[PDB]
Amino acid sequence: VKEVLFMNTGEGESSYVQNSSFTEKVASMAMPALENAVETLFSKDFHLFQAINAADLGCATGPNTFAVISTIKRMMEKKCRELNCQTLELQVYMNDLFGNDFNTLFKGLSSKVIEEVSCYVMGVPGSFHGRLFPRNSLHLVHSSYSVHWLTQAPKLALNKGRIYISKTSPPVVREAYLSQFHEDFTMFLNARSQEVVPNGCMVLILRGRQSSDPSDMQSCFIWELLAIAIAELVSQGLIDEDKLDTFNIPCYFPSLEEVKDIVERDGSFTIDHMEGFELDSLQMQENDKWVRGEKFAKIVRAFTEPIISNQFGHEIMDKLYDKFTHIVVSDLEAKLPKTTSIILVLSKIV
Amino acid sequence: VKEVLFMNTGEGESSYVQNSSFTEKVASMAMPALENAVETLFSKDFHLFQAINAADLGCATGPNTFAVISTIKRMMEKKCRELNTLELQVYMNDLFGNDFNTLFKGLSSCYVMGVPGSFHGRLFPRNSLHLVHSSYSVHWLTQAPKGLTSRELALNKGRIYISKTSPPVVREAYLSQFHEDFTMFLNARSQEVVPNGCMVLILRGRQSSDPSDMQSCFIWELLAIAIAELVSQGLIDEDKLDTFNIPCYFPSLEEVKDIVERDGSFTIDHMEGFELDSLQMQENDKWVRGEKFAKIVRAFTEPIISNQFGHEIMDKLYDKFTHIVVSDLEAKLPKTTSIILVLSKIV
Ligand SMILES: Nc1ncnc2c1ncn2[C@@H]1O[C@H](CSCC[C@H](N)C(=O)O)[C@@H](O)[C@H]1O
Ligand SMILES: Cn1c(=O)c2c([nH]c(=O)n2C)n(C)c1=O
Ligand SMILES: Cn1c(=O)c2c([nH]c(=O)n2C)n(C)c1=O
């Protein structure tokens, strides 16, 4: 399951790295959260000797992951100047599933090194649902749009005819995802529990929703639209529907209260600061519906192609996303509901 | 060179991972050297608490780097029980362009991480390493040795390494460079290894103490002729074979010592040499056993050579290589001398 989850490898031509415009803005909207978090590590005083270990979980191949490395070093070098002490060292651990194209990210990481603080970038392949780093190895943890991806799909059963929680899917389809996120998030939080230094800090950003029920269009339109495009191909006979009935995507966008309660029960890290914000799903600067759709199709296909192609096949991929782009521009007039995101800042209690 | 050096990236059939034939034997001989060093770290006692950091500097995409990790972890498993809750952190280090995807594809308490970059510079935080390993990686320079230019034409015309048909300065030139680059490796590593930490490094060198001995440099010699013959055919430019010199050096046992002596940070617990057959030689067909030697040569020299002559004429080059090895020498070459060197931070 984690053996086939990742984003478009390479390159970048219509891959993940080229189509990372939206997610870069989420980091931009949550950059101060990191900046404050770095300052707290300096207020801790204990982390000033001798080296500070930070890590980004779920870095893909895209240009977003060294954005935060830049802010961490910049902020660190700034407070390094106030302390008037050139001893600060920084080791950064970039984490993603094995299937990820590290060479593309490495080639990207190769350019930005090459200065008060030295920076050491290491790559850590593997799932973050288990333990990745030795005990008390991390002062700071950062994660953007990677937490919501589940360990496994929630569990002749059926979620007809969708790949996700919808208005057309009652009722354990909503409940399973809820308990499943609790299942996966707990592993994550608990695996971190032994990984982060006491009084450490944590900054998590994931895609969620403000609605009480996730079947609302704003919450689940990506999967609802994907579910339509695959279903229409079944009408054409290109794909068998019983595969669509069976396939549901291992991912989940939760509400803030659900997310809080998830962190509360496991009293490892107290919630320093939580917040929910909605960005315009796509820009929206183009008056051409095809332009808005294509830019949004290529970015949606970018982070969904490998996980979907596993179930439906490499070959038919091109036709599905073309049908998906079409119903966005023509059927939906290049207009989509807002996209909620959740800034989640924690600090280990032990 | 740091940008354009990597082993053959991929997974078959010319990839270095499929061509680990020779190196897996060297790792076997240095396994006891590795076995002991891992145990001396336990003798250092302080390393019991709390987690031990190991680093392989030069792991390619081949499976040989897992061979080193497996024994660190397995040896520790026995040491902990007698001592009665441990953790190991292994860093895989290599240049960029290294098929870490292939590396990590072959990959899948012990937590391993990938560290891209040269070991001629800083790679790890200060006082963070207890044990460091590097097999057949250190003898690569960061550049063609200085002093092969210009004077103002020149100089190793027409070969790619130290040979008989060459001015006396090339022996000094290659020894000059290696000294400089190795110091930086020792200099950089001097500030990462914990005090009384351990460092086990493996490279190949000469036993003849003369750089131009056929035994010591047959690989580059057999290549140099292989390139040269294809030059006569007009297939490859002539000036290129002359100007280009390979960024690698095979030091003597005594020459290694000085380098380590000059830089007082590391002391020598042990240092030895062992010569292995360049090929087996357990096979009867020369034309079908020299190819395996030809394949593994192509596994680590294709990218560094394709860079200067283009990948366009590569296939014909190693075709002559195999021909030279299997016809001229009748599939018989001098043994490859390998060097085990065990060090400790003098702090
Ligand atoms: N269980 C898991 N363990 C480790 N990484 C995971 C994971 N589930 C999803 N991911 C990774 O999380 C990534 C989200 S895309 C990365 C988001 C952001 N643009 C950035 O560059 O940081 C994907 O590459 C995916 O491989
Ligand atoms: C659910 N979700 C998105 O919606 C999204 C992602 N990156 C984008 O740019 N978008 C829009 N990823 C990574 C994802 O997980
Ligand atoms: C110079 N040189 C070799 O000659 C060699 C290597 N691997 C082997 O199997 N051989 C023989 N490597 C890694 C190397 O750099």
Residue numbers in the entry:
A (entry chain B): 9 to 122, 127 to 167, 175 to 369
B (entry chain C): 9 to 92, 95 to 118, 130 to 173, 175 to 369
Provide excerpts from the study:
Here, we identified three N-methyltransferases involved in the biosynthesis of caffeine from the leaves of Kucha. The structural characterization of CkTcS identified key residues around the substrate binding pocket that are critical for N9-methyltransferse activity. A previous study using 14C labeled caffeine has confirmed that theacrine is biosynthesized from caffeine, possibly initiated by oxidation at C8 to yield the intermediate 1,3,7-trimethyluric acid followed by N9-methylation.
To explain the substrate specificity of CkTcS, we determined the crystal structure of CkTcS in complex with 1,3,7-trimethyluric acid, in the presence of S-adenosyl-L-homocysteine (SAH), a byproduct of the cofactor SAM, at a resolution of 3.14 Å. Like the coffee methyltransferases, CkTcS exists as a homodimer, and this dimeric arrangement is preserved in the crystal lattice, with the dimer interface composed predominantly of hydrophobic interactions in the core region surrounded by hydrogen bonding interactions. Each monomer of the CkTcS complex consists of a core SAM-dependent methyltransferase domain and a short α-helical cap domain, both of which are involved in the binding of SAH and 5. The major structural difference between the coffee and CkTcS N-methyltransferases occurs on a helix (residues 236-255 in CkTcS), which contributes to the formation of the substrate binding pocket. In CkTcS, this helix is bent with the end close to the substrate moved away from the pocket. The 1,3,7-trimethyluric acid is enveloped in the active site through both hydrogen bonding and van der Waals interactions, with N-9 approximate to the thioether moiety of SAH. Particularly, the hydroxyl group of Thr-31 forms hydrogen bonds with both N-9 and O-8. The Thr-31-O-8 hydrogen bond may stabilize the O-8 carbonyl group in an iminol tautomeric state, which could facilitate attack of SAM for N9-methylation. Additionally, Phe-322 and Tyr-157 together sandwich the purine ring of 5 through a π–π-stacking interaction.
